[PDB]
Structures are given as structure tokens and as C-alpha cells.
């Protein structure tokens, strides 16, 4: 009752603002019949369908 105790929760829906880097997601569009571009999307990973 009056006895309270701390407890630890992991994997909790809490976020805070931060800055990082992000990677590519470009639609495949077959891309075998392709002529290159200044956007080197061959390095970019395929996007989620």
C-alpha cells in the first residue's frame, strides 16, 4: 500500500528530438533498362513495397 518501489520498463513508447543521418529508399522501376543519373541510386537500397 504505502510501500512504493521503482521498476524499470524497457521498450517503452518515449521519444525525444535528435539529429542523425538517413539512407535511401528509391523505387526499383526494374532499373535494368537504365542509363545512370547524377543520383547514384544503384547504391541506394530498394524501398519498402
Amino acid at each position: 500500500a504505502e510501500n512504493l518501489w521503482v521498476t524499470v520498463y524497457y521498450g517503452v513508447p518515449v521519444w525525444k528530438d535528435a539529429e542523425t543521418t538517413l539512407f535511401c529508399a528509391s523505387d526499383a522501376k526494374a532499373y535494368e533498362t537504365e542509363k545512370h543519373n547524377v543520383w547514384a541510386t544503384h547504391a541506394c537500397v530498394p524501398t519498402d513495397p
Binding site: 526494374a30 535494368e32 533498362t33 542509363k35
Partner: protein, 118 residues
């Protein structure tokens, strides 16, 4: 499909020039090279020309025949000059290996149907 469609056939006055051409698609014309046939009645199959991918040379059995390409366009031009009476056959453009390997005599796959040149 990696089929070859060809055009430019006709009748030639001995001592003229031809402009044979053929086009293919099929998302696989980066590994192959394009050459031609000279299948004629009575005789066996020989070769005429073969533009070697990965090297760029335009090898040909005889000096008059020259094979050529232009840019990224999927077309190939066989330019034929100063024709005599023995160039009466069916000309079929087919595909050879990455380096025109063992041409003039090999019988390839993914071949065309062949125009008739008289």
C-alpha cells in the same frame, strides 16, 4: 524475348552498296554481341561481321563489310559495299559471345530469321 528483327533487304545492282540493319531488345543485350550470317544455298554457313562488345572492334571476314553501332541505341548497321555476283544469300543477324569468340563458323542461339539479298 531476345529476338532479333532485321531490315534493309532488297535487290542490288552489282557494284552497289547495302545498308542492312537489325534491332533487338530483351533486357540482356549488354552481355551479348551482334554479328551476321551468310547462309547461301549449296554452301554451308559462314560469318560476315561481328561487332565485339567489351572491345569495340568491328571484325569482318572480308574488307568490304563493316559493322557499326551508334550510342546507346539498340540497333546495328551492316554496311556492305561494292557487291559482286556471289553475295546472293540470306543474311541473318545473330548474337555471339562477349568477345565475338569463335565466330565465322559457330552456330549461335537467339538468332533472327534473315533477309534475302539478291
Amino acid at each position: 524475348q531476345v529476338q532479333l528483327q532485321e531490315s534493309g533487304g532488297g535487290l542490288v545492282q552489282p557494284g552497289g552498296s547495302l545498308r542492312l540493319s537489325c534491332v533487338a531488345s530483351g533486357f540482356d543485350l549488354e552481355n551479348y554481341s551482334i554479328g551476321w550470317f551468310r547462309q547461301a544455298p549449296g554452301k554451308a554457313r559462314e560469318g560476315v561481321a561481328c561487332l565485339s562488345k567489351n572491345s569495340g572492334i568491328g571484325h569482318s571476314v572480308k574488307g568490304r563489310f563493316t559493322i557499326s553501332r551508334d550510342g546507346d541505341s539498340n540497333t546495328w548497321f551492316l554496311q556492305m559495299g561494292a557487291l559482286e555476283a556471289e553475295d546472293t544469300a540470306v543474311y541473318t543477324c545473330a548474337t555471339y559471345n562477349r568477345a565475338c569468340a569463335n565466330y565465322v563458323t559457330i552456330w549461335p542461339e537467339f538468332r533472327g530469321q534473315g533477309t534475302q539479298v539478291t
